[PDB]
Design a protein around this ligand. Structure first.
Ligand SMILES: CCCCCCCCCCCCCC(=O)O[C@H](COC(=O)CCCCCCCCCCC)COP(=O)(O)O
Lengths: 62, 50
């Protein structure tokens, strides 16, 4: 068999590749994952930093 | 006392419950001990001293 014959890939290929929209769906999901994890990173940092503020008993004697 | 406000009782209610108990104050101008009523930053007292 010759090396110039490409094997069968028709199980996995698209409607038409349509590069306008093969890039659309992959990058909406990569953008959503970066949006949620940047919000989660903020909430984590602000939870740890606020623990260093004056406690309830110190504010009661304020 | 303060942790009951907003959970089971009103602020005005808890201030009146605490004032029914006496707490050790700091000594007077000559070093003799004093007493005072309770405030919100105090802790709920127990029946026995030891
Ligand atoms: C070294 C710290 C990392 C610990 C991770 C352990 C995972 C167990 C659950 C997390 C408990 C903390 C909850 C919290 O802080 O408040 C919660 C944060 O909620 C979240 O978004 C979950 C955070 C999950 C992490 C997201 C991935 C990237 C994080 C970046 C790390 C720098 C509550 O939010 P809030 O403070 O109420 O606005």
């Amino acid at each position: 068999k010759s090396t110039y014959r490409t094997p069968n890939f028709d199980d996995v290929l698209k409607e038409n590749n349509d590069a306008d929209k093969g890039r659309s769906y992959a990058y909406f999901m990569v953008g959503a994952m970066g949006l949620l994890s940047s919000a989660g990173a903020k909430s984590t940092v602000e939870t740890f930093i606020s623990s260093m503020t004056a406690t309830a008993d110190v504010l009661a004697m304020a | 006392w303060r942790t009951l406000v907003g959970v089971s009782h009103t602020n005005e209610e808890v201030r009146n419950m605490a004032e029914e108990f006496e707490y050790d104050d700091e000594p007077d101008e000559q070093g003799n001990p004093k007493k005072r009523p309770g405030k919100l930053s105090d802790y709920i007292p127990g029946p026995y001293p030891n």
